[PDB]
Each structure stands twice: as C-alpha cells, then as structure tokens.
Design a protein around this ligand. Structure first.
Ligand SMILES: CC[C@H](C)[C@H](N)C(=O)O
Ligand SMILES: CC[C@H](C)[C@H](N)C(=O)O
Ligand SMILES: [Zn+2]
Lengths: 125, 119
C-alpha cells in the first residue's frame, strides 16, 4: 500500500447537492479535501482531483463503470463495482479494478483506491 | 427583504470535518456554494463569503456571539442567538429550535440590513 484513503464522507439525494470529503495518506502526508459534483461518486472524484492535481498525478480516464450483485438479491446485498480505466493520456492503455462493499458508493471508492495503488506502485523488478 | 438564504445544510461532529452548503437568492440569481471550517457556522460563513466576494459585498466583523434559551427549556428548546456586528456596532437575533439555523437567520437579517442601511 502506497496510498490509503483513511476516510471519506459522501452525501446526496433529492434536494441535496452532491458533495464529498476525502482523507488520504500518501508519502507520509495526510491530505484532506472537499468538493461538490453531479453525483456522490463524482463529487468524491472531484475532491480527489484537488489532492491529485497538487501532487502532479493525473487520474486515468473512467472508460466504463458497472455495478452488480451476487445471486440472492437483497437491499443489503454486497456490491461488485467494476471500473474500466485508461492509463494513457491519449491511444489504448485500458485496465480494470474492483471493489466489494455493502455500500455501493464505498465500493466505487475501494475500486478507485485499488486503481491508485496499481498506478503508484513502485516497479515490481 | 433583498437577500434570501433559500437553503443550507451544515454538517459537523466528532470524526467529521465541519462543512456547509449555502443556496442564496439575490437579484433574481441563485448562488450555491460549499466550504469547510473550524465549526459548522464558521464553515457556513466561509461558503457565504465566497458568494459575498463575487457579488462585491463586504461582511461586517463578528464582534460577539451569544446563544441563550428561555426558562425551563428541554433539549428541544427554542434558541435565541444574537450576533453583534461591527463604532458602527449593531446586533441581529435569530430564534429557532435549531441553534445553527438561528445563527443563519441572524446572518440573513444582517445581510438584509447591510444591503439596506436605511433599515
Ligand atoms: C460513473 C458515474 C458516477 C457513478 C455517477 N455520475 C455518480 O456520481 O453518482
Ligand atoms: C462564532 C463561533 C461559531 C459559532 C463557531 N466557531 C462555530 O462555527 O461553531
Ligand atoms: Zn454532508
């Protein structure tokens, strides 16, 4: 682990303007940010970008996004969020990460943290 | 009434960094903003200031802040919060069952008085 999302706070709904808070640990430093957006996850990514921009890290483009649940159904069902990223700033450098969580918003966050660590991972050798 | 706070939502607590959203109406246009702060009301003022600067209006300095309740009040008690602004000193009061909302009322009253000096 090179980057850890210590905590996040996501808020939306009919009547609410989507906004989110982020707390991440990268290179011994803790970064805290807020932002609004068109949706909960979107606001989160906007907040991330502020930290990300300051660090000279560019986030891979979101190419596809899919959320599924294992058989059995439920309102409290665990969520599989698949996100397709393109590493290239353009060209094809496509790859996928996943999150599993009771909360789907958190699952997308998980899948983003996995993406971040894959791209900031020191060379395997 | 020249300015209206159409809506706001303030969120704070232990483990939470204070932040607020503001939606205000002024001269036909609606302005929406967000901001963090040291406290809920403080986060609200930071957000308000962002709009305030855009519109070219300067907010008076907070000289004092007092929150009181009428006799025998439970936890659901109505709150009278009076804020004094800056001689050039004046006060605004808000009354509401929610204490942070009563400070928003007091700030809204100040904004309307400051934009209409003739009272
Ligand atoms: C990828 C789309 C995301 C999930 C959506 N716009 C949201 O913020 O809720
Ligand atoms: C004037 C003090 C205010 C109420 C406090 N800093 C708060 O935002 O909670
Ligand atoms: Zn919130």
């Amino acid at each position: 682990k090179v980057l850890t999302i210590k905590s996040c706070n996501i808020h939306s709904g009919i009547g609410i303007r989507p906004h989110a808070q982020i707390e991440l640990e990268y290179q011994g430093k803790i970064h805290k940010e807020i932002s609004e957006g068109d949706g909960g996850y979107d606001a989160f990514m906007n907040a991330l970008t502020k930290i990300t921009n300051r660090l000279g890290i560019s986030i891979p483009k979101l190419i596809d996004y899919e959320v599924r649940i294992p058989p059995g159904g439920k309102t409290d069902a665990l969520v599989e969020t698949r996100i397709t990223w393109n590493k290239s700033l353009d060209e094809d450098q496509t790859f996928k990460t996943m999150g599993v969580h009771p909360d789907q918003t958190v699952a997308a966050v998980h899948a983003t943290e996995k993406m971040l660590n894959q791209i900031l991972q020191p060379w395997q050798i």
